[PDB]
Amino acid sequence: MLSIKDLHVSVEDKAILRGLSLDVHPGEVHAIMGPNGSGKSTLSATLAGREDYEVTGGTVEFKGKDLLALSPEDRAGEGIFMAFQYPVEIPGVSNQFFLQTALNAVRSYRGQETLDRFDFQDLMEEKIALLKMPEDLLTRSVNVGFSGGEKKRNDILQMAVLEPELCILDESDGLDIDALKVVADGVNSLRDGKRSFIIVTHYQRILDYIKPDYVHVLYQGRIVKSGDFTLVKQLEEQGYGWL
Amino acid sequence: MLSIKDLHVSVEDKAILRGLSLDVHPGEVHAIMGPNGSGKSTLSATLAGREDYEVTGGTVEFKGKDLLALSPEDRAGEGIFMAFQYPVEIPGVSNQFFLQTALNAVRSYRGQETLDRFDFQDLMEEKIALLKMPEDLLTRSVNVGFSGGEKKRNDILQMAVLEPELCILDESDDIDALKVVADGVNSLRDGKRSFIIVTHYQRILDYIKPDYVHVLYQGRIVKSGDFTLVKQLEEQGYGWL
Amino acid sequence: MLSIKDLHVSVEDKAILRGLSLDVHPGEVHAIMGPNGSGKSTLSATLAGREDYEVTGGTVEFKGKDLLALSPEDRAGEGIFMAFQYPVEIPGVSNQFFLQTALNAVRSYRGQETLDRFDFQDLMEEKIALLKMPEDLLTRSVNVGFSGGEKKRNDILQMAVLEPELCILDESDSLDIDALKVVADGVNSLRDGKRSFIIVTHYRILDYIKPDYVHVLYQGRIVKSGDFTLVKQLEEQGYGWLTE
Amino acid sequence: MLSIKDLHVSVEDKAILRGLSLDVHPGEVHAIMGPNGSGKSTLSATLAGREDYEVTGGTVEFKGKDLLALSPEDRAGEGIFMAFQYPVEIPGVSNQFFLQTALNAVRSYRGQETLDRFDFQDLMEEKIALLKMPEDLLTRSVNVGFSGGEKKRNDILQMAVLEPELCILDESDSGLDIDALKVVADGVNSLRDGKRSFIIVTHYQRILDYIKPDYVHVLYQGRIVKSGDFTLVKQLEEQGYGWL
């Protein structure tokens, strides 16, 4: 699915990623962790041309295509997904209306028939039901004490509704145990055999919440070590738990 | 069409607006100024809709109706509008699609007939022609040195298309930008539409020349008058205000 | 739910609806009004599918399907309903029999289990009880002075029993408080927040109903629209003459 | 079969029939003629009991019983028939469906065996054949040019199907097509066995020339003034009374 080789990226003329290599195939959950600023977020921000850093070298292929070629919106069409923010107070454009426009934008790109207001309503009912999500998630409002996990419920819902091939997840930002708990839960609820996930995180704890297929340790823009979901233990036993 | 009587607004239980009053009649341009933190921005957020603005007292009347009961989008429908930023980029869907949805949301509210993508496109192509802007303002991209002027360009366009009775423009954050804002407010000026511009400093008033100017200090309009007001204070040694 | 775009309708080879457009979503109650010329009535006869109106242009979609390509009975099946008059009287058979038939036709269409004489008998009791109506509505006969509200009661029991998603009522009836209030109660009694209504009325029935939207029919085309306050707005902006 | 003695009937309080007497026995066809607005039409509606009026005085016996004591429905079960309209668009209620159910309710009332959907279909085809009527008569639709006659074909078909003893046909409608008039003349001839009777009210026309009535009564001022046989019309049109 995804194959990154010798990736070199720069942000504000400064080297962040210095030759990263990483292969992701269908049905796998990869956990990437390590000391922040060492390349955990800019990596994820590169698989989606959202921000505009600069790839100095290396290659990134996605299903046999130069992913670095497409634009952020076109990578969405190809299957690469990353949670986004709903527009603010735009008359006529509710959260559900926009989610629906996003889903159809990708179906048409894919050459599929767009969903109407009703069959999309049916769809939203399913995922909200499958992910045991608050039925009024797209119009609800909550107290600051719930905001954490709330943004995340909205992120997973986008992931359920958008039928992504590979979803990038940046969980490095507050100690929210409830929020991390919704991330881990959504992913598990969304792990068939064809979808892949790249979860980036500094606070390595959600690992013991989803049981990744692979775990990679990132230091100064380079995967330094990687194994299964036991890697954490193998390290603390080999005398390298500090990593 | 707009009358604000003794408005008290708080943000996170902190008092910002302390009894502000202001009337706005058709065909007028009011400029609201004052020392940053005087709440002149919250005055605009309050008229517009919310994020955390608690109206603790007072009234706000628009076209006779009670504005505060209304949601932001519905205020748009009622005729009071503040430019919005476009949603994240999505493949094969241009911002024209949302401008179109917004226009139809307001049209439905105002009891008028919606427009299909062909009818809308014509109406939009008409405005863009009047405001003489880049025919492709909704899909193109400009260097960072052009960001700002470009945002104002889009906003002004939204005003033209949604045709609100009262426009709220908050310029508290670029000579090029001041220019399109100024020029735009002068092209949408029809004698029946009104404007409330919140500016942090006296310059774009040199491009618009308001009917009224209002100094807001400590959460209250403390001094009003015509465009000469700015000079007045400047002379009496109150240039900071 | 219901979307009508540029609808053109002819009757006696005479043009009546002329590019009428209107959307109705779940939970809404809409009112349609104007002179006896704008064919408020032919709009409702067209939605229900009365075999006598020619669609010449436009489109009608319900829950996403082309409603115009459906038979009257199948429309009720899709959830589109308008009260019907009971058949002529036949010995030994009660109107209850036909209502039971109408429900079973709609349930079959929904691929659901039809009810038997008894199960239906049960449900009808429940609806009569909850609507607080005469237990023998389907069989009793009444004095002419009552007939007016008697038909509205039957219309309402029909809606309750058939539970449509979009209710169409034609109140352009040839003015009598008794009946109107009965209608007003039924509507308010059938509002669940998900089923919608379209009320075509000649004249206060709006006052007791408080529709979420109002529309004026000017010779086959909808002019003004907006929430219930519209009727007062027009009355205050001088255009009182429109509605009535 | 039918004995009407000194019948007085008022509509909306304006005396129409004023002591009308008539006897009709098995296998006779009786044409009622006379100036419009007169008792002829109110005579047909009083027998069928449909929206019946106010019988001030007199008696009506059918097969030995007081017909005026029976509801419109029981009288249909007793054997008296007058064409009716099929219920309009009630889900799961087609014309054939309704007919079958009207027939069965009449069979039950009579204590006879009812008919299931297979046996009914056969009676149906059977009758449609007999009358040489279109086979999709109960479902087809037609242009206005054929509107008039299409209605009588439906009335003639109900008549053949319901097995009536006494058929009442009201043909006092003006502007009727010659096409329509023929389907009724033909229908009556086809169903003219030697055991059922017919009362045809048709002064508005000339279908008598087609069916040869056994009796011809001329109704005037609410009373049967003169009556004879199929030649009575030339007898009156020989002695300048044609205007009757």
> Is residue C132 packed enough to be buried (19+ CB in 10 Å), middle (13-18) or exposed (0-12)?
exposed
Nearest to B194 by CA among B20, B11, B27, B21: B27
C91 touching D (Cβ < 8 Å)? yes
The answer to whether the beta carbons of residues A167 and A195 sit under 8 Å apart is yes
User: Check: CATH 3.40.50.12780 for A1-243?
Assistant: no
**Structure tokens given for C198:** 């379209």
The pairing of beta strand A214-219 with beta strand A29-33: parallel
Q: Is C38 annotated as a binding residue?
A: yes
In degrees, rounded to 5, the angle at the alpha carbon of residue B194 between the alpha carbons of residues B189 and B196 is: 115
Query: CB D141: neighbour CB atoms within 10 A?
Result: 8
The pairing of beta strand C2-10 with beta strand C54-62: antiparallel
Q: What letter represents residue C191's amino acid?
A: R
Taking contacts as CB-CB distances below 8 angstroms, the residues of chain C near B108 are 225
Residue A149 and residue D232: Cα distance in Å, rounded?
99
Residue D54 and residue D15: Cα distance in Å, rounded?
9
Strand order in the sheet with B194-199: B80-81, B166-171, B194-199, B29-33, B212-216, B221-225
For residue C171, report the phi and psi dihedrals to the nearest 5 degrees. Answer: -100, 20
Report resolution (Å) to 1 decimal: 2.5
Which residue out of A93, A104, A106, A114 would a mutagenesis test of the B interface target, given it has the greatest number of B Cβ atoms within 10 Å?
A93
Residue D235 and residue C18: Cα distance in Å, rounded?
59
Taking contacts as CB-CB distances below 8 angstroms, the residues of chain B near C226 are 109-111
What stretch of H or E contains B48?
helix B40-48
**Structure tokens given for A50:** 């959202």
CATH superfamily of the domain spanning C1-244? P-loop containing nucleotide triphosphate hydrolases (3.40.50.300)
In angstroms, what separates the C-alpha of B65 from chain A's closest C-alpha?
20
The answer to whether the beta carbons of residues C157 and C127 sit under 8 Å apart is yes
D80 Cβ contact partners less than 8 Å away, ≥ 6 residues apart: D47, D48, D62, D67, D164, D165, D166, D168
The answer to whether the beta carbons of residues A199 and A185 sit under 8 Å apart is no
Residue B199 and residue B205: Cα distance in Å, rounded?
9
Nearest to B26 by CA among B46, B2, B4: B2
Nearest to D41 by CA among D155, D153, D221, D171: D171
CA-CA-CA-CA torsion sign (C222, C224, C230, C232):
negative
Method: X-ray
> For chain A, where are the E strands, in sequence order?
2-11, 14-24, 29-33, 54-62, 80-82, 166-171, 196-201, 214-219, 222-227
Taking contacts as CB-CB distances below 8 angstroms, the residues of chain D near C106 are 91-92
Show which subunits contact B, needing at least 3 CB pairs below 8 angstroms: A, C
Output the CA–CA distances (angstroms, integers) from residue D230 to A36, A135, D187, in the order listed: 113, 81, 18
Q: In sequence order, what are the beta bridge partners of B18?
A: B8
In angstroms, what separates the C-alpha of C242 from chain D's closest C-alpha?
34
**Rg of chain A, C-alpha, whole Å:** 18
Question: Residue D39: helix, strand or coil by DSSP?
Answer: helix
Show which subunits contact D, needing at least 3 CB pairs below 8 angstroms: C
The answer to whether the beta carbons of residues C32 and C232 sit under 8 Å apart is no
The answer to whether the beta carbons of residues C243 and C32 sit under 8 Å apart is no
Residue holding tokens 């091939």? A165
Residue B114 and residue A57: Cα distance in Å, rounded?
51
The pairing of beta strand C196-201 with beta strand C29-33: parallel
The topology (CATH level 3) of B1-241 is Rossmann fold (3.40.50)
C6 Cβ contact partners less than 8 Å away, ≥ 6 residues apart: C19, C20, C21, C57, C58, C59
A102 Cβ contact partners less than 8 Å away, ≥ 6 residues apart: A76, A84, A158, A162, B90
DSSP 8-state symbol, A66: B
> Is residue D238 packed enough to be buried (19+ CB in 10 Å), middle (13-18) or exposed (0-12)?
exposed
In angstroms, what separates the C-alpha of C210 from chain D's closest C-alpha?
30
Residue B69 and residue B73: Cα distance in Å, rounded?
12
In angstroms, what separates the C-alpha of C36 from chain A's closest C-alpha?
35
DSSP string, B137-158: TTT----GGGTTHHHHHHHHHH
Output the CA–CA distances (angstroms, integers) from residue A182 to A83, A187, C20, in the order listed: 14, 9, 48
**Structure tokens given for D10:** 């008022």
The answer to whether the beta carbons of residues C180 and C151 sit under 8 Å apart is no
Show which subunits contact C, needing at least 3 CB pairs below 8 angstroms: A, B, D
In this complex, does chain A touch chain C, defined as having at least 3 beta-carbon pairs under 8 Å apart? Answer: yes
Output the CA–CA distances (angstroms, integers) from residue C189 to A37, B188, C175, C196, D219, in the order listed: 62, 49, 22, 13, 54
D200 Cβ contact partners less than 8 Å away, ≥ 6 residues apart: D29, D30, D31, D32, D169, D171, D184, D188, D207, D208, D211, D213
Q: In sequence order, what are the beta bridge partners of D23?
A: D3
Q: Is B209 annotated as a binding residue?
A: no
Please count the residue pairs, one from chain C and one from chain D, whose beta carbons lie less than 8 angstroms apart.
Answer: 72
Q: CB C93 to CB D87 under 8 A?
A: no
Of all residues in chain B, the one with the smallest CA distance to A71 is B91
